[PDB]
Design a protein around this ligand. Structure first.
Ligand SMILES: [Ca+2]
Ligand SMILES: [Ca+2]
Length: 701
């Protein structure tokens, strides 16, 4: 179906203006004029063509080859001419289960019909003639190396379409620009033509004629654009300028802490004394100069989970000589553009700066599913992985000594550092036209080259989570990399992240590019500054189509509404933004508030404080504890309810005088208190909070 001979159809007589490149499943190599909608009528006249591939016979015999235009054809089988501008009955012996190279050239001056009607036949020893069937034809070996049975180069006899990197796309098309259009059953690759293709919304591709994969990834420029590729590769990475590669971090969903048994305590029948908390995990990115790493940071919930206000040690019965253990539920997350099949990366679980508590490994070659881009392992419809699994005798306890435990209690943070060891790659095989995991292909042989030859953009426009993409970009000092097309900042955002420009303004899902800020590493910053100066431009947002990306740039693009920590996690927002986000109140009562709040805003709030203010200006704080601020919840209808009763002994607010005010304040993550004060105070005293609702009793109804 994606198999057969590869054909190049030229408008000129001498094989130099390719109009269509496409495959044929059978010996019918025709292109009817009805299929040439994307070619100018005048270029629909084909004066030459070349086909290449292999023939595999099902039975040894003597065959004679013929075409529908023998006077215009020369054909080679494994370097030997079988047709030479004349019909013949010259038989050739072909052996079953052997592969023979095929090259066919056709030339005809001034055709009177558009397209091409052309069939390749053979006749066996019994004198039966037919168009060669699909089971007998295979594509050329369009790879960087030959296989044992299939040479990557066609015979030096006759014409060679210039294809320096052997990906299948002619040099000239890669440089000048090409488009791909899907006929009913075939993909046609043709030159870009402004006045035809622009209006139709077709993508203009350019790629390096000297790089088999312009992004230095494991899929060729041709494989990508013709769909001869792992179906799990992300849509954006089907562009030859966007790198296809996995990017993995670990998400921790919840944690349970408990005291380790010890030989001195023979008693094992005591009551449960564990601490269980939800956790929130974010993939991070830091200013570390040379970084190319995977890491995530875990925030352990500090909100009320059990009676009293005990220390963790008191809760768990931990004395100073005891040790504690952690278990957790996790998933792997692939935010990259290619899947993983047989090796999950190894992860260190780290306390503080550099105290490793655990090394998390999965068994190689025993994955229960693929880890696909924009997805999880295990999938979300399945249970997560427990670090110490119930079925597993050999899971290492994740232990902390007393001092480490106290440090975890104080910081309520862990870090997960994940390596970039991703295993084998599923590649396309031209012999059988299928994608399979290839034992000879490994991500570790690809990643360094991807990292060296691309510009990196990290963007948080999807739910404020950091998503990295890499785009092929020129390196002015590496000659091979100068053969790549110019990559602009505007184009990179379109092809890598799906920005569009419906009305003269670049947008991501309705939000203008000006709603996002640009952050650069030191070298990228100097580069971009220099470019702006050379453009006489004072504002980057008006010249995104003129800013050129270079290999090894690092660009970070973040939603401007938010405040960010050093990990580039969103942790707050300006008071004006938070106030406006809460302005639309659906209902209010002594039981709480019902509001429509934007999902991104909700992400940066740790909770709310409710207070009644009397006429003299004194305030009664209702939920007056740092661990009692979790009073918001998202309803199924998408609305947020702020629950006044939850920490008011299950009672609606009592407003003794209608002139009293009910005030509700939002507390952002960056302002959240996560421990009692040094003096032991557990109240909300001093917490930096943002007034988001204030109404008198008679206004609440
Ligand atoms: Ca090529
Ligand atoms: Ca190429």
């Amino acid at each position: 179906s994606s198999q057969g001979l590869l054909g190049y159809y030229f408008s000129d007589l001498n094989f130099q203006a390719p109009m269509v490149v496409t495959s044929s499943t059978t010996g019918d190599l025709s292109i009817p004029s009805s299929e040439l909608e994307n070619i100018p009528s005048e270029n629909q006249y084909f004066q030459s063509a070349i086909w290449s591939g292999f023939i595999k016979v099902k039975k040894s015999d003597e065959y004679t080859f013929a075409t529908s235009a023998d006077n215009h054809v020369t054909m080679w089988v494994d370097d030997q001419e079988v047709i030479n501008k004349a019909s013949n009955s010259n038989k050739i012996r072909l052996e079953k289960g052997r592969l023979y190279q095929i090259k066919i050239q056709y030339q005809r001056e001034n055709p009177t019909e558009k397209g091409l009607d052309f069939k390749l036949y053979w006749t066996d020893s019994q004198n039966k003639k037919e168009v060669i069937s699909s089971d007998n034809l295979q594509l050329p070996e369009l790879k960087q190396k030959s296989s044992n049975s299939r040479k990557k180069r066609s015979t030096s006899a006759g014409p060679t379409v210039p294809d320096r990197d052997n990906d299948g796309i002619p040099d000239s098309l890669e440089v000048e620009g090409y488009t791909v259009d899907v006929k009913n059953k075939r993909t046609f690759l043709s030159p870009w033509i402004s006045n035809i293709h622009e209006k139709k919304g077709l993508t203009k591709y350019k790629s390096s004629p000297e790089k088999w994969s312009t992004a230095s990834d494991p899929y060729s420029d041709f494989e990508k654009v013709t769909g001869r590729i792992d179906k799990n590769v992300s849509p954006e990475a089907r562009h030859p300028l966007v790198a296809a590669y996995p990017i993995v971090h670990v998400d921790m969903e919840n944690i349970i802490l408990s005291k380790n048994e010890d030989q001195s305590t023979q008693n094992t029948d005591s009551q449960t004394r564990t601490i269980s908390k939800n956790t929130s995990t974010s993939r991070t990115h830091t200013s570390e100069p040379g970084s190319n790493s995977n890491s995530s940071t875990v925030a352990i919930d500090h909100s009320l989970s059990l009676a009293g206000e005990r220390t963790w040690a008191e809760t768990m019965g931990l004395n100073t000589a005891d040790t504690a253990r952690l278990n957790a539920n996790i998933r792997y997350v692939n935010t990259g553009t290619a899947p993983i099949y047989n090796v999950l990366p190894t992860t260190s679980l780290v306390l503080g700066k550099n105290q490793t508590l655990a090394t998390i490994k999965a068994k190689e070659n025993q994955l229960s599913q693929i880890l696909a881009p924009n997805n999880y392992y295990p999938s979300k419809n399945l249970a997560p992985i427990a670090l110490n699994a119930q079925d597993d005798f050999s899971s290492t306890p994740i232990t902390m000594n007393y001092n480490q435990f106290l440090e975890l209690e104080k910081t309520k943070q862990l870090r997960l550092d994940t390596d970039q060891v991703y295993g084998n790659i599923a590649t396309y095989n031209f012999e059988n036209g299928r994608v399979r995991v290839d034992t000879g292909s490994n991500w570790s042989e690809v990643l360094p080259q991807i990292q060296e030859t691309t510009a990196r953009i990290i963007f948080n426009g999807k739910d404020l989570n950091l998503v990295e993409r890499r785009i092929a970009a020129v390196n002015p000092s590496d000659p091979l990399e100068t053969t790549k097309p110019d990559m602009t900042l505007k184009e990179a955002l379109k092809i890598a992240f799906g920005f569009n420009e419906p009305n003269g303004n670049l947008q991501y899902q309705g939000k203008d590019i000006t709603e996002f800020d640009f952050n650069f590493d030191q070298q990228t910053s100097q580069n971009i500054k220099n470019q702006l100066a050379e453009l006489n431009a004072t504002n980057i947002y008006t010249v995104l189509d003129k800013i050129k990306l270079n290999a090894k740039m690092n660009i970070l693009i973040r939603d401007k509404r938010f405040h960010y920590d050093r990990n580039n996690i969103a942790v707050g927002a300006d008071e004006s933004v938070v106030k406006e986000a809460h302005r639309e109140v659906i209902n209010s009562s002594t039981e709480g508030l019902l509001l429509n709040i934007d999902k991104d805003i909700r992400k940066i709030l740790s909770g709310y404080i409710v207070e009644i203010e009397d006429t003299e200006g004194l305030k009664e704080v209702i939920n007056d504890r740092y661990d009692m601020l979790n009073i918001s919840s998202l309803r199924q209808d998408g609305k947020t309810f702020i629950d006044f009763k939850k920490y008011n002994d299950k009672l609606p607010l009592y407003i003794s005088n209608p002139n009293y005010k009910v005030n509700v304040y939002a507390v952002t993550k960056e302002n959240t208190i996560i421990n009692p004060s040094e003096n032991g105070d557990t109240s909300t005293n001093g917490i930096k909070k943002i007034l988001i609702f204030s109404k008198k009793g008679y206004e609440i109804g």
